[PDB]
A paper describes a structure:
We have solved the 1.9 Å crystal structure of the Fab fragment of RAC18, a therapeutically important Ab with protective efficacy against the plant toxin ricin, an agent of bioterrorism concern. Ricin toxin, derived from the castor bean Ricinus communis, is a prototypic A-B toxin. RAC18, directed against the A chain, has the greatest neutralization activity, in vivo protection, and highest binding avidity. In this manuscript we compare results obtained using different Ab modeling tools with the actual X-ray crystallographic structure (1.9 Å) of the neutralizing anti-ricin mAb RAC18.
Among the 11 AAs, L96 is in CDR L3; the other 10 are part of the heavy chain. Heavy chain residues are Y32, Y33, and N35 in CDR H1; L50 in CDR H2, R99, L105; and F106 in CDR H3, and W47, A97, and R98 in the heavy chain framework. The shape of the pocket can be approximated as a half-ellipsoid with an estimated height of 8 Å, and major and minor axes of approximately 12 Å and 5 Å, respectively. There are 6 hydrophobic and 5 hydrophilic AAs in the pocket, and 2 hydrophilic AAs (R98 and R99) are charged. Although we have not identified the Ab combining site experimentally, it is a reasonable assumption that the pocket we describe, lined by residues from the CDRs, is likely to participate in binding to antigen. The pocket structure made by the RAC18 CDRs contains basic residues (R98 and R99) and is partially hydrophilic, and might support positive Q98 interactions. Although there is a great deal of similarity, this figure shows that dissimilarities in a small region of the CDR H3 loop account for much of the differences in the RMSD values calculated for the crystal vs. PIGS or WAM. (4) RosettaAntibody is the best at energy-minimization based loop modeling, especially the complicated CDR H3 modeling, because the H3 structure from RosettaAntibody has the smallest RMSD, highest TM-score, and lowest Z-score. PIGS has the best performance in predicting the 3D structure of the RAC18 Fab in terms of RMSD and TM-Score, and its overall performance in predicting the VL and VH regions measured by the Z-score is also the best, although differences are within experimental error and probably not significant.
Numbering used by the authors:
A (entry chain L): 1 to 214
B (entry chain H): 1 to 220
Amino acid sequence: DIVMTQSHKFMSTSVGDRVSITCKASQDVTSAVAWFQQKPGQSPKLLIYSASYRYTGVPDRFTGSGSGTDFTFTISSVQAEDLAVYYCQQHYGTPLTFGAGTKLELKRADAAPTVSIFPPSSEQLTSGGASVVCFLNNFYPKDINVKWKIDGSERQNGVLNSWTDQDSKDSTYSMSSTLTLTKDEYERHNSYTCEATHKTSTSPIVKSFNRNEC
Amino acid sequence: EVQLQQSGPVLVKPGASVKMSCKASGYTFTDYYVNWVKQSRGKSLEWLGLIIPSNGGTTYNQKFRGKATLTVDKSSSTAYMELNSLTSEDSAVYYCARRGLTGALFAYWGQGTLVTVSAAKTTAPSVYPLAPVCGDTTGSSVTLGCLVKGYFPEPVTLTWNSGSLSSGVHTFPALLQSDLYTLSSSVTVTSSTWPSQSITCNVAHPASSTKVDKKIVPRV
């Protein structure tokens, strides 16, 4: 099976900038390569086919080239509506295959996350569960590290993270980290902490609380 | 113009089978092959196979041999794809597509059909209001939360104050655990207006015909 590898999972650009995405085939596929654009909730859209030809209706800012194993897709001058996921594909071999995609995102000034921690709701405890939630909102870039600490010890078991896509309004990212334990275990620890590490600061942003302390 | 209309979403259990349709219009059905593509959660695209309308001849991705069956009804210019012995691994959006110009493959796409495979039973969500830490928070802005846990199937519609608050809201993608979904949402308000100006989390789950409200209240 021929593997198509794209240059990046994410790429940051600015309106008016020139951007290029590349793809490498694990085997020679001549010029049987296509490039697609896909927006959330929509089907992929063909932009470039046979490595270098624009499909009907595709704007001149989109071009591509390559033959063999190395291909390039270029947007000469990025427009706001071009922020999306781009995929390359090869149809020389069988089965035809797609790359994993490259998400083109918008660059903006760095922003530290706003961190908030939340002890389990009283209602959840009555059911025997204990979820501690930590929100890390509106930060940039997307790169971030969150670690939980219970009474000073790092905890990784029972933690689930969820991320929102780059916001269309302020170009920031947000994340939710949830540490779930049973009520029984939650009631055997005192201090709960969620600390975030982001490039915007050498020091971690720490949010904590002590169980039953009001 | 060329159009490919696919059938609605389906939700079934492991071991089941499903048959979806792709109605072609705007051209002579038998003039082009119909390809099918699978896209799983993370947006991973995979080719399933293709069918030649005129003869019914088929070509499959070895990976999906015996799992997918392609057929056509020339009479109604419709292509069908049937999946059998379903498992959670088959959950994904399935697309039908057609080529354009000359050699311009995948020039036209259907809107896709969502297929969800799970053994889970319909379960209404437990909705938990998350007020700030008992100790205190700083600044004039504060963030509140709402945890929606243990529901099935997707989706749920979460709003704050019945939709009156939206600007400072972040509703995160749901996570599947032990066959059940969980999601969280946060809302950030300004000018020390909480708890003076009430905030409530509302959650609707049509599959269970439920609608619940949870007012956020200071911890006492």
